[PDB]
Amino acid sequence: MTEYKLVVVGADGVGKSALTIQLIQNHFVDEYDPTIEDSYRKQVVIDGETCLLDILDTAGQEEYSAMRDQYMRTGEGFLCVFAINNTKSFEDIHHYREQIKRVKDSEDVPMVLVGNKCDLPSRTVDTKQAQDLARSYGIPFIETSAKTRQGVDDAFYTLVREIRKHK
Amino acid sequence: MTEYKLVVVGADGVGKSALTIQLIQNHFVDEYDPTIEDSYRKQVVIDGETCLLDILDTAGQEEYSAMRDQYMRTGEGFLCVFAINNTKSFEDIHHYREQIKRVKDSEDVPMVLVGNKCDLPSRTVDTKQAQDLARSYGIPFIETSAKTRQGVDDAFYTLVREIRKHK
Ligand SMILES: Nc1nc2c(ncn2[C@@H]2O[C@H](COP(=O)(O)OP(=O)(O)CP(=O)(O)O)[C@@H](O)[C@H]2O)c(=O)[nH]1
Ligand SMILES: Nc1nc2c(ncn2[C@@H]2O[C@H](COP(=O)(O)OP(=O)(O)CP(=O)(O)O)[C@@H](O)[C@H]2O)c(=O)[nH]1
Ligand SMILES: CN1CCC(C)([C@]23NC(=O)c4ccccc4[C@H]2c2ccccc2N3)CC1
Ligand SMILES: [Mg+2]
Ligand SMILES: [Mg+2]
Structure with a gap:
């Protein structure tokens, strides 16, 4: 059964863990428990194909930044997450992108840009600004939204589709 | 930082995932989502020492039995879980212990016998009988109980102490 190694990356607090847990447990976690490194295996059906998703939920805290090199070498696709109510998290996206491109030594790494917390009314990052970055x-x-489940399945399925295109 | 590699093993349905999630997230999962393989890295203080617990939540489904060798080699201590309302799960304990002993090629591997679901009134395994098995x-x-949190911290901390008392 085809396996896909997906890695969730982004600034500390954007909702990487909440997105992953929502996807896998169908439960929204309101607590903030900073992650070191957690991994999950889930069997799903995408476009009629039964897939195994190997999801790595990484640390946003820079304390654990030395762990990035190994997960970027083995990761097949990257979910690059920012929060729509955190300007700094959007600015931190390019750093994750640049690091992934450098480790992979490639410009066509399967990635999906995710703007999380879209359920909140405190938006500080314009959707247009994010769309434009994704185009570059x-x-x-x-x-x-990890809370409402809006776009969650779509974000992970799209990333799997990006890996399939690249294979 | 001292790291402890803990592995949660047992028959399908005993509550391995519910115990792990209760330990780490302090809530009880009513849902039954069979596990393939999930891992967690969590920082804790045990006996005044800051520890890193690497917890592996394994598959109880007999279909994934070929995966056991690798996690038994890597694992330092094993939480051997049965459910007090499932006699097959209690008898399956012997098979997990014999397999661990064989992979490790040792008779004194750190283990803790856990009788889960102690909140339920449908008991089929006497406490005395489980106590006698652990003594042997x-x-x-x-x-x-992953539901009430009874004995959960004690089960994981005791296993860490077994790894520590073995060293
Ligand atoms: N309203 C809302 N809150 C969210 C959403 N996603 C995550 N959160 C909240 O933001 C906080 C951080 O979520 P978390 O999943 O721990 O973020 P993280 O990026 O994994 C944190 P770390 O990098 O340290 O592991 C939590 O309080 C969580 O409930 C969302 O989509 N909507
Ligand atoms: N009453 C009660 N129910 C529990 C307890 N622990 C787990 N359960 C329940 O048993 C079912 C299976 O729990 P789960 O944690 O998935 O067990 P598991 O051993 O991980 C199953 P698998 O081996 O396939 O991964 C769930 O419905 C869950 O709510 C408990 O301590 N008490
Ligand atoms: C016991 N396994 C549990 C799964 C694992 C955490 C991790 N899985 C790997 O195969 C692997 C191999 C080398 C380095 C890192 C990894 C991880 C990895 C990276 C990207 C996406 C998923 C994911 N799964 C490794 C440890
Ligand atoms: Mg996290
Ligand atoms: Mg499980």
């Missing part, structure tokens, strides 16, 4: 990278952009 | 193995026995 030539990657899809999807807005999500 | 020379390991600690604790009854737990």
